[PDB]
């Protein structure tokens, strides 16, 4: 339930790097531990927590310790904000890590508390069996970094499972990516991510649907569809690439951007 260990707080400061013109979005302001040591450090920092009760006594709190820069979790709209902290209910940890994906402007960091196993998915290494499709999400669109470990004795009350604390810093670029069409493509992929893509693509669903889109593209954009075998037009591209033998668990977010760049040159998308 609630974090109270005072030498964790710390961690997260530091691991944040907030500076006075920062705008701080803490999402599960608990008793507002952290909350006050946000507070002098961050321009303002806006906090968003399910319970309307809680969140009286933190603003009572902050108020009473001199602090007048505080202002009150998928439902809510995200504000713009420059640097996020948050401890994660493990049921809404994956649809989090999307919303930060596609929040906009940009933000500069976020410094995430969450259950052990997805916090270990979300740092896998490549080639590992529980590398997944979150693992390639969360490293194309971030850096990825374990700041510690969290054990269940330094929550009140204690629950049955261990945490871990993990800072995203953006990556500016990644977000030219499609993404709509890179997890689509990732979801093909990773169906089942330890048979070759060769393996994957032949499948006559596959080229069946990928067809119909290539078809459908053509006719959006007033072109001629290529006087060519379609299997062969998609299988070229894994051909081209030298990737026809490479499993996607043992593929990079390098890759799979590759992969998505030669098949919409050929009209090729994901949809």
């Not at 399910?50 to 504000?79: Q, W």
């Not at 993990?166 to 048979?195: A, G, H, M």
């Not at 070759?196 to 990928?210: D, G, P, W, Y």
């Not at 499993?247 to 590759?258: A, G, H, M, T």
Request: contains cysteine; hydrophobic residues 40%; positive net charge.
């Amino acid at each position: 339930h609630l974090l109270k260990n005072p030498g964790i707080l710390d961690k997260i400061i530091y691991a944040a790097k907030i500076k006075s013109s920062d705008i701080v979005l803490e999402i599960g302001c608990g008793t507002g531990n952290l909350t006050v040591k946000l507070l002098p450090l961050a321009k303002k920092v806006i906090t968003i927590d399910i319970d309307s009760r809680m969140i009286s006594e933190v603003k009572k709190r902050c108020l009473y310790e001199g602090y007048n820069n505080l202002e009150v979790a998928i439902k809510t709209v995200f504000p713009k904000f420059d640097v996020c902290t948050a401890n994660i209910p493990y049921k809404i940890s994956s649809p989090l890590i999307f919303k930060l994906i596609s929040h906009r402007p940009l933000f500069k960091c976020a410094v995430l508390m969450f259950q052990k196993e997805f916090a270990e998915r979300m740092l896998a290494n490549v080639g590992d069996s529980n590398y997944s499709r979150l693992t390639i999400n969360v490293k194309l669109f971030c850096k990825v970094t374990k700041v510690c470990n969290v054990n269940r004795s330094s929550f009140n009350p204690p629950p049955k499972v261990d945490s871990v604390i993990v800072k995203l810093i953006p990556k500016e670029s990644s977000f030219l990516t499609n993404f709509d069409e890179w997890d689509n493509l990732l979801r093909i992929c990773f169906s089942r991510k330890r048979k070759t893509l060769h393996a994957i693509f032949k499948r006559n669903a596959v080229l069946n649907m990928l067809e119909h889109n290539y078809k459908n593209w053509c006719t959006l954009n007033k072109q001629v569809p290529v006087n060519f075998p379609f299997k062969k037009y998609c299988l070229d591209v894994l051909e081209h690439l030298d990737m026809c033998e490479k499993r996607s668990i043992n593929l990079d977010e390098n890759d799979f951007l590759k992969l998505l760049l030669e098949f919409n040159k050929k009209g090729i998308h994901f949809f």
